[PDB]
């Protein structure tokens, strides 16, 4: 009756097959599992690549799945995601910086980027207010190539955050990544500009913590789960089942993920 939408973005067939087996064995057939390329709700996206239709890329440190090394840490990493076009077409994150060099008009693209940053900034400040932190950390790659997209990102993110009344501290990519992996307790809320390096940093943090499920906020309004490994996908499915209104099944999947990461399907 109900439907779970599986999106594949750069994920090996093994992970997708594992996810399908897990849901089928745990759900028992009550909720069907259909595959697609875009969704707004009841969706799990497998693979490092960012799907189409997501504007925010928040991720946290769930208490249940905290690794013993990272016990007690509490930091929220939100990556701003610009609208994604077809693979052949030039992405906005690159168009916004190259068209300016080429002299092409960049009005509509700026407007679209501004809207995406505002939504991401609103999500980040809401998380910061909920956690109670007073200052957030913006992350922008300091490469000369990305001298326009980051500039707009800073101009808008700081504007929205300052309007909300919180402080912003701008930093690069290498220093923040090292701090987040080594001393993450000194960062409460960190926003990341839309760059490939930032995406890798988000994945590394999601994996080093012990394997977690990232939350994507889409344009249509909602939250969709995202995973890249067996444990992360298993946690993503468990959260998705919990959202559908299944508590016991979600707990079983979470327990199986904690015990046997690479073979949860057989473990449960």
């Amino acid at each position: 009756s109900k439907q779970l939408t599986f999106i594949s973005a750069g994920a090996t067939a093994a992970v997708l097959q594992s996810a399908s087996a897990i849901v089928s064995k745990v759900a028992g057939g009550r909720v069907q599992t259909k595959t697609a390329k875009e969704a707004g709700r009841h969706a799990v996206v497998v693979g490092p690549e960012t799907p189409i239709g997501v504007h925010t890329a928040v991720t946290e440190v769930p208490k249940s799945a905290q690794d013993p090394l990272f016990s007690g840490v509490s930091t929220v990493v939100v990556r701003a995601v610009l609208p994604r076009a077809a693979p052949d077409s030039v992405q906005l994150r690159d168009a916004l910086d190259v068209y300016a060099s080429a002299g092409i008009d960049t009005k509509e693209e700026v407007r679209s980027a501004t809207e995406a940053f505002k939504k991401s900034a609103e999500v980040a400040v809401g998380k910061a207010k909920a956690k109670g932190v007073k200052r957030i950390v913006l992350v922008v790659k300091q490469a000369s190539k990305h001298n326009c997209i980051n500039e707009l990102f800073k101009k808008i993110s700081t504007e929205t955050i300052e309007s909300a009344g919180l402080t912003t501290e701008v930093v690069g990519t290498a220093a923040v990544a090292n701090q987040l992996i080594v001393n993450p307790e000194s960062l409460g809320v960190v926003l990341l500009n839309d760059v490939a390096a930032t995406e890798q940093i988000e994945l590394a943090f999601a994996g080093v913590v012990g394997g977690v499920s990232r939350v994507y906020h889409t344009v249509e309004g909602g939250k969709i789960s995202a995973g890249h490994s067996f444990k992360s996908v298993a946690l993503a499915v468990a959260q998705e089942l919990r959202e559908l209104g299944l508590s016991s099944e979600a707990d079983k999947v979470e327990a199986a993920a904690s015990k046997n990461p690479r073979a949860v399907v057989s473990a449960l």
Binding site: S89, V90, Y99, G103, I104, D105
Partner: protein, 196 residues
């Protein structure tokens, strides 16, 4: 480079199967895309008042100017011009402007029948370099493709020196990632599609 590294970085060749067809194809799609945005909209259609081919017009011009060759008299550049000279200059200027717009880049006549401002000499020189550069690039990209040499450019680097100079392998590995990917791709666009 202090510290025993965990891995023997292999060349990042993982998707060598990047068929030149589809690689160049995506390049052409991107190329056509950027050009349309920069220019704008296709101009409104125009209907010809008369039907005639460029070759026919050129032949008619040659016939018209051939009968006055005996009457036509040369003179110094600073001296006043004749009716025949003025007609010839105007006709040839229009004809060669049309040809250059079309694509028949014959520099020898363009530099004669269209150059009247040092600006035009500059433009001719710029166009002359571009055509020769494209010809050489195509020839070597073909000769490079015959040898199987990596279509893309390859920098003159000695990574054993670089792995020693730098202390952390991460930037060095990333630098090796990029160039090896660059050398494994064909940086070309089907110009047949660009010409249309």
């Amino acid at each position: 480079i202090s510290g025993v590294s965990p891995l023997l970085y292999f060349p990042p060749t993982t998707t060598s199967t990047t068929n030149r067809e589809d690689q160049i194809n995506k390049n052409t799609n991107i190329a056509i895309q950027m050009i349309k945005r920069y220019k704008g909209e296709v101009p409104p259609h125009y209907t010809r008042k008369s039907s005639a081919t460029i070759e026919q017009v050129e032949k008619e011009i040659d016939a018209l100017l051939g009968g006055a060759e005996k009457l036509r008299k040369t003179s110094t550049d600073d001296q006043p011009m004749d009716k025949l000279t003025l007609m010839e200059r105007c006709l040839r200027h229009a004809l060669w402007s049309y040809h250059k717009e079309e694509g028949r880049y014959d520099f020898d006549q363009i530099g004669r029948w269209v150059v009247y401002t040092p600006e035009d000499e500059v433009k001719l020189a710029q166009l002359k370099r571009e055509v020769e550069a494209k010809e050489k690039l195509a020839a070597l990209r073909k000769r490079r493709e015959e040898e199987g040499l990596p279509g893309g450019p390859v920098p003159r680097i000695n990574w054993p020196q670089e792995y020693s100079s730098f202390i952390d392998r991460e930037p060095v590995v990333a630098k090796r990632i990029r160039y090896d990917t660059l050398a494994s791709t064909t940086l070309e666009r089907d110009e047949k599609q660009i010409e249309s």
